Amino acid sequence: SGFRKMAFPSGKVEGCMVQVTCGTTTLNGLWLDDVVYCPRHVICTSEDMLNPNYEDLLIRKSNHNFLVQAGNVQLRVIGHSMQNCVLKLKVDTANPKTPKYKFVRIQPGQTFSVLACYNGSPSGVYQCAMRPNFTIKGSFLNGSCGSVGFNIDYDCVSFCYMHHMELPTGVHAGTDLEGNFYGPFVDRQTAQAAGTDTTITVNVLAWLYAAVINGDRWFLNRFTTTLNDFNLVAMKYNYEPLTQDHVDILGPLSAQTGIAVLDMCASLKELLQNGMNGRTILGSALLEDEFTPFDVVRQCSGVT
Amino acid sequence: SGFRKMAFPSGKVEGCMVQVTCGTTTLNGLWLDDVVYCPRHVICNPNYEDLLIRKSNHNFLVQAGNVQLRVIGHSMQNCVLKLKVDTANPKTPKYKFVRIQPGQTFSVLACYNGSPSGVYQCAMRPNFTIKGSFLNGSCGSVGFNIDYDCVSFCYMHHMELPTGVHAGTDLEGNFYGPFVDRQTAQAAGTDTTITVNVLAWLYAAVINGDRWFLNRFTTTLNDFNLVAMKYNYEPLTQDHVDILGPLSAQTGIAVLDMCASLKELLQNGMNGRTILGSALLEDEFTPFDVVRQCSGVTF
Numbered sequence A: 001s002g003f004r005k006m007a008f009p010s011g012k013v014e015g016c017m018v019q020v021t022c023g024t025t026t027l028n029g030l031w032l033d034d035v036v037y038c039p040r041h042v043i044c045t046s047e048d049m050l051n052p053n054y055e056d057l058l059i060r061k062s063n064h065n066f067l068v069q070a071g072n073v074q075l076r077v078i079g080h081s082m083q084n085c086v087l088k089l090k091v092d093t094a095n096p097k098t099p100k101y102k103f104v105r106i107q108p109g110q111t112f113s114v115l116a117c118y119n120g121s122p123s124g125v126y127q128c129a130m131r132p133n134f135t136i137k138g139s140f141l142n143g144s145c146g147s148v149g150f151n152i153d154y155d156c157v158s159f160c161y162m163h164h165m166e167l168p169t170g171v172h173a174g175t176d177l178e179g180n181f182y183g184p185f186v187d188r189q190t191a192q193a194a195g196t197d198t199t200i201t202v203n204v205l206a207w208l209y210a211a212v213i214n215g216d217r218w219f220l221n222r223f224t225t226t227l228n229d230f231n232l233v234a235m236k237y238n239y240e241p242l243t244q245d246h247v248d249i250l251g252p253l254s255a256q257t258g259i260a261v262l263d264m265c266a267s268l269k270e271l272l273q274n275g276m277n278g279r280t281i282l283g284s285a286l287l288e289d290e291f292t293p294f295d296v297v298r299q300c301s302g303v304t
Numbered sequence B: 001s002g003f004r005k006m007a008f009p010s011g012k013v014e015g016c017m018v019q020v021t022c023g024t025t026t027l028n029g030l031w032l033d034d035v036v037y038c039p040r041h042v043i044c045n046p047n048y049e050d051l052l053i054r055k056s057n058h059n060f061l062v063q064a065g066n067v068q069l070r071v072i073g074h075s076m077q078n079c080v081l082k083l084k085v086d087t088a089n090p091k092t093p094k095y096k097f098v099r100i101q102p103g104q105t106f107s108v109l110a111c112y113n114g115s116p117s118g119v120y121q122c123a124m125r126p127n128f129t130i131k132g133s134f135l136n137g138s139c140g141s142v143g144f145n146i147d148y149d150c151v152s153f154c155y156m157h158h159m160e161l162p163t164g165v166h167a168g169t170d171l172e173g174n175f176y177g178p179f180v181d182r183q184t185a186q187a188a189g190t191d192t193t194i195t196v197n198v199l200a201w202l203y204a205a206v207i208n209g210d211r212w213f214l215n216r217f218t219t220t221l222n223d224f225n226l227v228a229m230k231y232n233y234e235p236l237t238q239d240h241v242d243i244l245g246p247l248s249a250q251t252g253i254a255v256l257d258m259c260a261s262l263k264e265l266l267q268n269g270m271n272g273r274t275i276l277g278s279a280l281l282e283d284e285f286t287p288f289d290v291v292r293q294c295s296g297v298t299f
C-alpha cells in the first residue's frame, strides 16, 4: 500500500557523470563508452549567449581546450563534434561503468527520473514529467546544465533528457541525447517563454485508477460521458484533450478496477466542477498529473 | 529554481542489496563486508530463538545478482538477523548505522527479490511510522542518508500496518515505535504535523519567490504553541527556532515572524492559493533538506 513519486535507482547513471570545463564555464557531461555528451553552450561566454555562432566558436577550439574530469581522474579529449545542441567529446578511455543504454526521444506527458549534478557530482534524484508545453518543472541551480533524465527498463537505461536552461518562470528546458530541443526553445539568451501549460489528462485518470486500486472510491459517480463532451468540459479547465489512444492506453487499469474509461472521465468532470471538499486522494489535495498509466501499473499492486 | 521531493543518489546502496530466502519466505538483505543484514521474520506468536536454533547455515539462500553467497554463520541482534557470508562485498561503501528521530527524513531504496526498483524520499512520522510505498516482498528494503561519501543506514522495512503505513527498525534491529514483529492487533497512533518542517518549507517557498502568506505580525513561542496544539501540530521548541536560524538569515524573516504566517494559514486556510505547487502545508522537508536543495550539495 501507499503511493509515492518514485524515481528509478540512479546508480547506473551516477557511474557516467563527469565534469566538463571550457575556459571559465563548468557543467556536467555524460560519459558512455569513449564519448562525453554535454550542452554545446559550454563553449560560450555570457556575452556570447545573446547571438552565439556555435560553428564559429567551435572552430577556434582544440581538443586540449576541453578539460574532462571523471572523479579525481582527468580524461584526455582526442576529438570533438557538434550534433544539434550537444557537443560530443571523444575521449581516449572508454567508461568501464557504461551500462546497457539507449537514447530515446519522449513525448509530452511521459515521466522520467532526473539525476541533478554539480561539477560532475550527483547531488539528488527526483521524478518529473515532460509538460505539454515541453518544459519540465525541475529543481536546478546554476551549474546543473548537462544533468540527465532517464528511465530504466530491465537492465537498460533509456536517456531521454539533458538539461540546458532555466526559463523566466522558473521552469526548465533541454534536449534529447541527440541535441534536439523539446519545444520551440533555443540555446540562446532570447525572449522565449514557456507556452500556457495544461494538465496531462491521461495521467490524472491513471492516478484516479491508482486511488481506486489502493481502496478509495469516494469520487466515483453513477454517470458516464461521451469522449467529445468530456473534452469540451476538460478544455475549460486547461486540461489536455483526451484521445482514443489515451483511452486505449488506460484499458488495463479499467479492466483491473472494473471502471470504464468514460465512467472514470465522468468522475474527473465532477471533481473539476466540485473540488475535493476537504478530502484528499492518495494524500493529495490537488489532481496529480505526473504519473503515467505505465507508472501506476509498475508501482501499484496487481490486486484490487 | 524549483522545489522537488528529492532523494539521495542510490548507487552506493544498490551495490549492497541481496535476496535472502529461508524456506518459503523471500525478502531483501543488506550486504556490507562479510555480513548480510535482514529482518529476523525471514525465519517465520513466534519464539525467535527457538525458531533460529532449528536452522543451519545452508537453510539460508543468499543471492547477490546471479551469484549465490555461502552462509558460514548466523546470529540475531534484536529484530535483525546477521548472516555471515564467505565473500566480503567489494562494493561496500563507507557507512555508519544511525538511529533517526521523528521528523527526520531519509531516502528509501524499495527492493523486491534483491533487485532495487525505485527510490523515494520520506520522513519518520511523530507516530514512528513512515508513509512509504511498499508491496509484498519489500521487507528488508533500507532507508539512508548520505553525507560526503558516507552512507548512514537508518531504517530497515519490516511490515505494513492496517492503515497502509509502514513500520521498521534501525540497522541494530530496534523498532521505531511501539511495534513488534508478528501478526497481532497493531495500529499506528494518532499522527501529528512536523511543525519545524512546515516552517522550513515556508522558507523554501520564500526563497523560490512566493511571499503572499507573509504578514507584518509576530508571535511569542508560547502563543504559537497554544495555537499549534489545537491543529494537531507538534510543539515548536527553542531548539527548532535555533535550527531555523540560517533560513531566517537568508530570507530576512524572523522565525517567530514565520510562525505568525503559519498561525494565519492554520486559522484561515489558503483561500484558493498554493505554496510550491501544493494546496496542503508540507512537513516532509527538514531545515537541512531545504538548505541542501537550495545550495547544490553533491555526493
Ligand SMILES: COC1CN(S(=O)(=O)N2Cc3ccc(Cl)cc3[C@H](C(=O)Nc3cncc4ccccc34)C2)C1
Residues within 6 Å of the ligand: A041, A049, A140, A141, A142, A143, A144, A145, A164, A165, A166, A167, A186, A187, A188, A189, B001
Ligand atoms: C534563472 O536565471 C536565468 C537567466 N540565466 S543565466 O544564468 O543568465 N543563463 C542564461 C542561459 C541562456 C541559454 C542557455 Cl541554453 C543557458 C543559460 C544558462 C542557464 O539557463 N543556466 C541555468 C540552468 N538551470 C538552472 C539555473 C538556475 C539558476 C541560474 C541558472 C540556471 C545561464 C538562467
Ligand SMILES: COC1CN(S(=O)(=O)N2Cc3ccc(Cl)cc3[C@H](C(=O)Nc3cncc4ccccc34)C2)C1
Residues within 6 Å of the ligand: A001, B041, B134, B135, B136, B137, B138, B139, B158, B159, B160, B161, B180, B181, B182, B183
Ligand atoms: C497488508 O497486510 C497485512 C497483514 N500482512 S501479511 O502480509 O499477512 N504479513 C504479516 C506480517 C507480520 C509481521 C511482520 Cl514483521 C511482517 C509481516 C508481512 C508484512 O507486513 N509485509 C508487508 C510489508 N510492506 C508492505 C506489504 C504490502 C502488502 C502485503 C504485505 C506487506 C506479511 C500485512
Ligand SMILES: [Cl-]
Residues within 6 Å of the ligand: A105, A106, A107, A110
Ligand atoms: Cl514517450
